[PDB]
Design a protein around this ligand. Structure first.
Ligand SMILES: C[n+]1cn([C@@H]2O[C@H](COP(=O)(O)OP(=O)(O)OP(=O)(O)O)[C@@H](O)[C@H]2O)c2nc(N)[nH]c(=O)c21
Lengths: 174, 35
């Protein structure tokens, strides 16, 4: 006897399996979709912590209909607010920051500019784990700025962890 | 108008009884999911 609380958006959780035989897109896999708070927690409570993913693997949470790749119409001209962690920060902060990121997404924490958010991505990597929020238009400087500011506040980033914005066009070049 | 939730409320919902059952068609991905 419970009424679930609906989210503004329906979301999809993706997993990326590091298989070097296969193409990047072919390693991408849909786990599940949800559109209530309680379904979010039901999913979260039955998946692995990011810090325990195999090296080279990712989680992505994206709005329904947006694939977690540069090529998607909604990401093409977009970009990301990115933080990179070192090795001790995997243990102490990765899982905390990822969950905080997820709550920013589903809770629509960026006011009107929440419509500019496409999703978020966590990359578990030997060289240093990465968390990012993907936004739809790198040129919407107001949206980008506000999202970045609020996101940095909600994460509670210490100054030793810098947060930076880059367009996917530049990433896909380098 | 937009449905917005702050952190404290989202966290309180985690205790709900509906969050203790996995999603119905959760796939089997050993090490990643617990269906
Ligand atoms: C997010 N993304 C990652 N890849 C591929 O996987 C590679 C690794 O990208 P990465 O996001 O996994 O970073 P990584 O830490 O592994 O290494 P880095 O490039 O030095 O930062 C990319 O260079 C692409 O070949 C991608 N390839 C395509 N076609 N589209 C994407 O959106 C995409």
């Amino acid at each position: 006897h419970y009424i679930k609380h609906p989210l503004q958006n329906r979301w999809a959780l993706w997993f990326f399996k590091n298989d070097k035989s296969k193409t990047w897109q072919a390693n991408l896999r849909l786990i599940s979709k949800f559109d209530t708070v309680e379904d979010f927690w039901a999913l979260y409570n039955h998946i692995q912590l990011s810090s325990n993913l195999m090296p080279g693997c990712d989680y992505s949470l994206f709005k329904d209909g947006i694939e977690p790749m540069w090529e998607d119409e909604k990401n093409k001209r977009g970009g990301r607010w990115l933080i990179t962690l070192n090795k001790q920060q995997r243990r102490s902060d990765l899982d905390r920051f990822w969950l905080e990121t997820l709550l920013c997404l589903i809770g629509e924490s960026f006011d009107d500019y929440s419509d500019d958010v496409c999703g978020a991505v966590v990359n578990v990597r030997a060289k240093g784990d990465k968390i990012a929020i993907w936004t739809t238009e790198c040129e919407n400087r107001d949206a980008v700025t506000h999202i970045g500011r609020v996101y940095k506040e909600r994460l509670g980033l210490p100054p030793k962890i810098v947060i930076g914005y880059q367009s996917h066009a530049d990433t896909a070049t380098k | 108008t937009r449905i917005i939730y702050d952190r404290k409320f989202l966290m309180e919902c985690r205790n709900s009884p509906v969050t203790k059952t996995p999603p119905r068609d959760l796939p089997t991905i050993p090490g990643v999911t617990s269906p």
